Amino acid sequence: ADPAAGEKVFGKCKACHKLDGNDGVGPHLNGVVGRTVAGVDGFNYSDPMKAHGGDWTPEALQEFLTNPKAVVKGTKMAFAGLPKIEDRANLIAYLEGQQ
Ligand code: HEC
């Protein structure tokens, strides 16, 4: 529920993701909440990500951020994970503000 704290957590995402609409190592994350999984046109998603389906609901996002490869096995997103539920919740709150 704390976007200010979530903003700090995003420091762990900025190396590959932007919130300005630009795509790089990873797709832009501004507007990601509720967004179609593998829904950014032009971005070269892995096959498992494209086969996943569904939307990036708060629950799907929080699980994915805890362990990317457990949620989308074979994803090309190389990230250790956020083991603290508060960090995940705060980060999601922050992203929701950038919808
Ligand atoms: C680069 C080393 C990354 C870091 C650090 C984080 N992410 Fe990432 N992410 C990256 C790639 C290469 C991809 C594509 C994965 C694939 O298999 O195709 C992604 C993807 C995501 C997605 C899905 C986006 C979509 O449009 O479907 C999400 C929701 C996402 N990444 C979130 C995320 C956050 C919040 C991070 C910091 C905690 C984070 N990523 C770090 C590469 C990298």
Side-chain angles (χ1 to χ4, degrees):
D2 185 2
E7 182 179 14
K8 298 183 177 185
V9 187
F10 191 82
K12 295 188 174 183
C13 315
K14 67 186 186 183
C16 310
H17 293 280
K18 294 185 187 176
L19 295 171
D20 66 357
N22 290 128
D23 302 321
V25 172
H28 65 277
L29 294 181
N30 53 290
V32 76
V33 186
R35 194 174 72 196
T36 298
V37 174
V40 175
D41 263 345
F43 186 81
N44 187 16
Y45 292 99
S46 72
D47 282 352
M49 193 61 79
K50 288 189 294 190
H52 192 277
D55 296 330
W56 279 122
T57 66
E59 181 56 37
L61 273 176
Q62 82 96 349
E63 294 184 15
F64 178 69
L65 295 180
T66 311
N67 193 330
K69 282 168 176 171
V71 174
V72 187
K73 185 165 177 168
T75 176
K76 65 183 192 175
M77 169 154 137
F79 178 61
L82 297 173
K84 299 183 204 176
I85 180 70
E86 54 260 53
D87 288 355
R88 305 198 299 273
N90 290 341
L91 180 48
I92 292 173
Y94 171 67
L95 293 173
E96 283 173 352
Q98 301 310 305
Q99 200 71 192

